[PDB]
């Protein structure tokens, strides 16, 4: 199966009420395995998955030290971008960074990512060849010139094609039971009578891992794309996800409808029908 390791970082300025908030998290596929929070008591990188807990003190001290360097670098960036954008020192602002890597079923490199956003918009991003940058505006161009000169991309390329892949793999083989599973969805339908002439028909997918699913209704073979209330896939809280798609059926027409479920763990897609 394809796998991905991603790291997500947020710095938010707290003008007047201190030092910014820095939160770092890390994910292998849909499983979070680490975190650092600026406002936390410990000032260490902490496990958020049991399979990373028995890494050595060497790993935790090593990861703590690196994330704390990250933390410092972004609280420098909050100042720099406020200058680049000529903002007031009073307002609260946000930098986000995300980087990581994707492997194929073969566990060899597919793609590396490296991107920033100031206040919810793309600031700068390493392009897919991992050689060039996409600098949004003039300030992101100042930043691009800097990282061009200091050969930051060649060094980044080496983390994402090497030591990111190596870690992802390790994590996969060390967290094998969590990370290399496919929980197929448990599906079922419900029928609620909205009125004497109308009823909701909801198709549930529950306990599936990974988060990817297509839950789709149909009437006599035709897509029901505008007529379906589809919710956003949500965590159940135990490491699986949930999702439902619902349609309001004109009474007596229940047989016309089919719910279609596609997920990694289904040998074949399901077609469910109320009957």
């Amino acid at each position: 199966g394809s796998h991905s390791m991603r790291y997500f970082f947020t710095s938010v300025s707290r003008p007047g009420r201190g030092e910014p908030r820095f939160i770092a998290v890390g994910y292998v596929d849909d499983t979070q395995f680490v975190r650092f929070d600026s406002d936390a008591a410990s000032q260490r990188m902490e496990p958020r998955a049991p399979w990373i807990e028995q890494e050595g003190p060497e790993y935790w001290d090593g990861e703590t030290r690196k994330v704390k360097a990250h933390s410092q670098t972004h609280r420098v960036d909050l100042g720099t971008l406020r200058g680049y954008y000529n903002q007031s020192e009073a307002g609260s602002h946000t930098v986000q960074r995300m980087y990581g890597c994707d492997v194929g079923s073969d566990w060899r490199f597919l793609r590396g990512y490296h991107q920033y956003a100031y206040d919810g918009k793309d600031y700068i991003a390493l392009k897919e060849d991992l050689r060039s940058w996409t600098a949004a505006d003039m300030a992101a161009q100042t930043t691009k010139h800097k990282w061009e000169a200091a050969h930051v991309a060649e060094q980044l390329r080496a983390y994402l094609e090497g030591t990111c892949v190596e870690w992802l793999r390790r994590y996969l083989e060390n967290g094998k039971e969590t990370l290399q599973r496919t929980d197929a969805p448990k599906t079922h339908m419900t029928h609620h009578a909205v009125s004497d002439h109308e009823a909701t028909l909801r198709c549930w997918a529950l306990s599936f891992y990974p988060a990817e699913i297509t839950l789709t209704w149909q009437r006599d073979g035709e897509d029901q794309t505008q007529d379906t209330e589809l919710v956003e896939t949500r965590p159940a809280g135990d490491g699986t996800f949930q999702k439902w798609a619902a349609v309001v059926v004109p009474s007596g027409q229940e047989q016309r409808y089919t719910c279609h479920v596609q997920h990694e763990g289904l040998p074949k897609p399901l077609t469910l029908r109320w009957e």
Binding site: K66, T163, W167
Partner: peptide, 9 residues
């Protein structure tokens, strides 16, 4: 495991 180096904007 994260990046061993940092660089500022």
């Amino acid at each position: 495991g994260i990046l061993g180096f940092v660089f500022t904007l």
